[PDB]
Ligand SMILES: *C(=O)N1C[C@H](NOS(=O)(=O)O)CC[C@H]1C(N)=O
């Protein structure tokens with residue numbers, strides 16, 4: 054029905070296609086959609102090459118796997134936390150087909166895109182719940198639904214083997230575990246509570262062996278990378294922190 058197909062083309066061009074990605078919300082411009090419209094051998098469709106470009110660019114713009122994260126810190130205002138293990142990436146070919154299908158349906162819509170990674174793009178990467186590790190002030194907070202639920206001085210890694218910055222997360226929890234390391238070569242360390250955040254096996258754990266925790270102590274008594282924590286505190290922390298909670302670690306540019 055050419056009559057019907059042309060009415061289809063009208064509708065399609067007039068669709069309000071809205072994306073919600075990492076918190077930002079926006080509408081795909083009507084001019085971009087009229088561009089993409091096609092009609093060939095009696096079939097209405099969209100120019101895949103062009104739609105795929107658009108979706109590729111969404112990736113370039115928004116992907117938390119390749120774009121750092123602006124973070125409102127506790128002591129320093131808005132800082133930039135670099136990419137880490139807690140991230141996601143838009144799957145270009147899946148999203149391209151999904152977006153075409155949505156648009157050719159010709160009904161107004163909102164979507165967040167198809168991604169692969171630690172969470173989805175339907176919400177901002179960081180929300181009201183997270184662990185903040187301010188490496189400069191050498192101090193750590195656990196925020197839960199907006200409010201600080203616990204805080205403490207810590208000891209980061211020594212300057213030869215420093216704690217890296219990035220948007221990390223608690224990917225596992227383990228009790229009475231025993232960690233392996235290197236110095237001239239092999240060594241060990243038993244720990245009551247262990248929460249890794251990184252793929253090189255950085256993580257947050259208790260320290261019997263650190264007598265005090267604070268400001269300068271890291272320069273001489275620093276760790277191999279991990280975040281040494283008061284044992285009375287670390288227990289109480291492991292108690293309240295769900296697996297999957299993000300951990301933001303940062304120091305001064
Ligand atoms: C964390 O950086 N690691 C885990 C483990 N514990 O470190 S600590 O005893 O210095 O606090 C061993 C070293 C290191 C690693 N390379 O896994």
Ligand SMILES: [Cl-]
Nearest residue numbers: 138251252253
């Ligand atoms: Cl991995």
